[PDB]
Design an enzyme around this catalytic site. Sequence first.
Site, PDB file in Angstrom:
ATOM      1  N   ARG A   1      -2.525  58.829  43.095  1.00  0.00           N
ATOM      2  CA  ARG A   1      -2.037  57.557  42.577  1.00  0.00           C
ATOM      3  C   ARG A   1      -1.682  57.665  41.098  1.00  0.00           C
ATOM      4  O   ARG A   1      -2.509  58.067  40.278  1.00  0.00           O
ATOM      5  CB  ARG A   1      -3.105  56.480  42.796  1.00  0.00           C
ATOM      6  CG  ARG A   1      -2.605  55.047  42.710  1.00  0.00           C
ATOM      7  CD  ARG A   1      -3.575  54.102  43.413  1.00  0.00           C
ATOM      8  NE  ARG A   1      -3.763  54.466  44.820  1.00  0.00           N
ATOM      9  CZ  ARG A   1      -3.198  53.834  45.847  1.00  0.00           C
ATOM     10  NH1 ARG A   1      -2.403  52.792  45.641  1.00  0.00           N
ATOM     11  NH2 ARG A   1      -3.418  54.257  47.085  1.00  0.00           N
TER      12      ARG A   1
ATOM     13  N   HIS B   1       3.087  66.135  52.610  1.00  0.00           N
ATOM     14  CA  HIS B   1       1.744  65.736  53.007  1.00  0.00           C
ATOM     15  C   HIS B   1       0.755  66.773  53.522  1.00  0.00           C
ATOM     16  O   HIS B   1      -0.418  66.454  53.684  1.00  0.00           O
ATOM     17  CB  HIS B   1       1.853  64.586  54.018  1.00  0.00           C
ATOM     18  CG  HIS B   1       2.769  63.482  53.582  1.00  0.00           C
ATOM     19  ND1 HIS B   1       2.441  62.593  52.581  1.00  0.00           N
ATOM     20  CD2 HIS B   1       3.999  63.119  54.016  1.00  0.00           C
ATOM     21  CE1 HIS B   1       3.427  61.729  52.420  1.00  0.00           C
ATOM     22  NE2 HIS B   1       4.385  62.027  53.278  1.00  0.00           N
TER      23      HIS B   1
ATOM     24  N   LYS C   1       4.273  50.294  59.590  1.00  0.00           N
ATOM     25  CA  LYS C   1       4.322  49.252  58.568  1.00  0.00           C
ATOM     26  C   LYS C   1       5.673  48.546  58.507  1.00  0.00           C
ATOM     27  O   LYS C   1       5.731  47.352  58.217  1.00  0.00           O
ATOM     28  CB  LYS C   1       3.968  49.829  57.196  1.00  0.00           C
ATOM     29  CG  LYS C   1       2.485  50.063  56.993  1.00  0.00           C
ATOM     30  CD  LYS C   1       2.201  50.721  55.649  1.00  0.00           C
ATOM     31  CE  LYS C   1       0.703  50.815  55.397  1.00  0.00           C
ATOM     32  NZ  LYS C   1       0.384  51.584  54.156  1.00  0.00           N
TER      33      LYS C   1
ATOM     34  N   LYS D   1       6.736  59.984  41.783  1.00  0.00           N
ATOM     35  CA  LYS D   1       6.455  59.283  43.035  1.00  0.00           C
ATOM     36  C   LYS D   1       5.160  58.501  42.815  1.00  0.00           C
ATOM     37  O   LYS D   1       4.124  59.085  42.510  1.00  0.00           O
ATOM     38  CB  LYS D   1       6.293  60.274  44.194  1.00  0.00           C
ATOM     39  CG  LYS D   1       6.087  59.601  45.545  1.00  0.00           C
ATOM     40  CD  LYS D   1       5.991  60.603  46.690  1.00  0.00           C
ATOM     41  CE  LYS D   1       5.891  59.876  48.028  1.00  0.00           C
ATOM     42  NZ  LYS D   1       5.779  60.806  49.187  1.00  0.00           N
ATOM     43  N   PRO D   2       5.217  57.165  42.947  1.00  0.00           N
ATOM     44  CA  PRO D   2       4.083  56.250  42.765  1.00  0.00           C
ATOM     45  C   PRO D   2       2.774  56.701  43.416  1.00  0.00           C
ATOM     46  O   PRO D   2       1.748  56.810  42.742  1.00  0.00           O
ATOM     47  CB  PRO D   2       4.597  54.953  43.387  1.00  0.00           C
ATOM     48  CG  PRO D   2       6.051  55.004  43.095  1.00  0.00           C
ATOM     49  CD  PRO D   2       6.396  56.431  43.437  1.00  0.00           C
ATOM     50  N   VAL D   3       2.813  56.947  44.724  1.00  0.00           N
ATOM     51  CA  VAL D   3       1.630  57.386  45.467  1.00  0.00           C
ATOM     52  C   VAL D   3       1.983  58.397  46.548  1.00  0.00           C
ATOM     53  O   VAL D   3       3.114  58.438  47.033  1.00  0.00           O
ATOM     54  CB  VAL D   3       0.900  56.201  46.153  1.00  0.00           C
ATOM     55  CG1 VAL D   3       0.347  55.235  45.115  1.00  0.00           C
ATOM     56  CG2 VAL D   3       1.842  55.484  47.115  1.00  0.00           C
ATOM     57  N   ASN D   4       0.997  59.199  46.935  1.00  0.00           N
ATOM     58  CA  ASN D   4       1.190  60.203  47.975  1.00  0.00           C
ATOM     59  C   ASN D   4      -0.162  60.614  48.538  1.00  0.00           C
ATOM     60  O   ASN D   4      -1.194  60.452  47.884  1.00  0.00           O
ATOM     61  CB  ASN D   4       1.919  61.432  47.420  1.00  0.00           C
ATOM     62  CG  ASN D   4       2.379  62.387  48.515  1.00  0.00           C
ATOM     63  OD1 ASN D   4       3.195  62.028  49.362  1.00  0.00           O
ATOM     64  ND2 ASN D   4       1.858  63.606  48.497  1.00  0.00           N
ATOM     65  N   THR D   5      -0.152  61.138  49.759  1.00  0.00           N
ATOM     66  CA  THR D   5      -1.378  61.577  50.407  1.00  0.00           C
ATOM     67  C   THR D   5      -1.206  62.976  50.984  1.00  0.00           C
ATOM     68  O   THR D   5      -0.176  63.291  51.579  1.00  0.00           O
ATOM     69  CB  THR D   5      -1.784  60.620  51.543  1.00  0.00           C
ATOM     70  OG1 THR D   5      -1.934  59.294  51.023  1.00  0.00           O
ATOM     71  CG2 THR D   5      -3.100  61.055  52.165  1.00  0.00           C
TER      72      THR D   5
ATOM     73  N   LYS E   1      10.085  68.262  55.506  1.00  0.00           N
ATOM     74  CA  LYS E   1       9.804  67.397  54.366  1.00  0.00           C
ATOM     75  C   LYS E   1       8.395  66.816  54.480  1.00  0.00           C
ATOM     76  O   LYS E   1       7.679  66.706  53.484  1.00  0.00           O
ATOM     77  CB  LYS E   1      10.840  66.271  54.280  1.00  0.00           C
ATOM     78  CG  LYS E   1      10.721  65.407  53.037  1.00  0.00           C
ATOM     79  CD  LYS E   1      11.787  64.323  53.016  1.00  0.00           C
ATOM     80  CE  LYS E   1      11.705  63.491  51.748  1.00  0.00           C
ATOM     81  NZ  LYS E   1      12.703  62.385  51.739  1.00  0.00           N
TER      82      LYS E   1
ATOM     83  N   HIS F   1       6.813  61.178  58.876  1.00  0.00           N
ATOM     84  CA  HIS F   1       6.493  60.169  57.866  1.00  0.00           C
ATOM     85  C   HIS F   1       5.004  59.830  57.838  1.00  0.00           C
ATOM     86  O   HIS F   1       4.401  59.625  58.886  1.00  0.00           O
ATOM     87  CB  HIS F   1       7.302  58.904  58.184  1.00  0.00           C
ATOM     88  CG  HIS F   1       6.883  57.687  57.417  1.00  0.00           C
ATOM     89  ND1 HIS F   1       7.177  57.509  56.083  1.00  0.00           N
ATOM     90  CD2 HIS F   1       6.232  56.566  57.812  1.00  0.00           C
ATOM     91  CE1 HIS F   1       6.727  56.330  55.689  1.00  0.00           C
ATOM     92  NE2 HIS F   1       6.150  55.739  56.718  1.00  0.00           N
ATOM     93  N   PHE F   2       4.409  59.796  56.646  1.00  0.00           N
ATOM     94  CA  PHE F   2       2.993  59.431  56.525  1.00  0.00           C
ATOM     95  C   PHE F   2       2.994  57.928  56.276  1.00  0.00           C
ATOM     96  O   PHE F   2       3.462  57.469  55.235  1.00  0.00           O
ATOM     97  CB  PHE F   2       2.312  60.155  55.363  1.00  0.00           C
ATOM     98  CG  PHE F   2       0.813  60.012  55.364  1.00  0.00           C
ATOM     99  CD1 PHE F   2       0.017  60.939  56.027  1.00  0.00           C
ATOM    100  CD2 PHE F   2       0.199  58.940  54.723  1.00  0.00           C
ATOM    101  CE1 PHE F   2      -1.373  60.800  56.052  1.00  0.00           C
ATOM    102  CE2 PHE F   2      -1.186  58.794  54.745  1.00  0.00           C
ATOM    103  CZ  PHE F   2      -1.973  59.725  55.410  1.00  0.00           C
ATOM    104  N   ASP F   3       2.454  57.163  57.219  1.00  0.00           N
ATOM    105  CA  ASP F   3       2.475  55.710  57.090  1.00  0.00           C
ATOM    106  C   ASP F   3       1.299  55.085  56.353  1.00  0.00           C
ATOM    107  O   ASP F   3       1.493  54.206  55.516  1.00  0.00           O
ATOM    108  CB  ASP F   3       2.644  55.058  58.468  1.00  0.00           C
ATOM    109  CG  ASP F   3       3.344  53.706  58.403  1.00  0.00           C
ATOM    110  OD1 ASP F   3       4.374  53.593  57.706  1.00  0.00           O
ATOM    111  OD2 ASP F   3       2.882  52.758  59.070  1.00  0.00           O
TER     112      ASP F   3
END
EC number: 4.6.1.18
Length: 120
Positions: free
Chosen positions: A81, A12, A62, A37-41, A7, A115-117
């Site tokens: 974004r 990412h 976080k 999805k609000p934001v992603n990188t 995932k 997980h991308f923090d």
Amino acid sequence: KETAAAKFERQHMDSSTSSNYCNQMMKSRNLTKDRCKPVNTFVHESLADVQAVCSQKNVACKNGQTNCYQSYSTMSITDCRETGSSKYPNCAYKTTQANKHIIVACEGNPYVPVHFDASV
């Protein structure tokens, strides 16, 4: 479905690859299936380089957990974004290219990113 590691790669990783990048990528990787999805990188470095971050600088996540790691060197990333005009199923995104250190949470055996923090 898929593993936490799988995932992370789907959400990412983009070692391969504009102003339309996020609009296409967020859709391609199925991040706009149920909702926008609000934001992603996305990280443009090799999988090896990103996986290597799990043995780099240990920092607090976080959410307070202690399994987060920060890259020693900056990495080429793209931040996505959601705009205001964006309305599901027509999710609109703002594409922003940058070079920053990434922070990811790692777990498992092998110990890999799940997980991308954040990006700093």
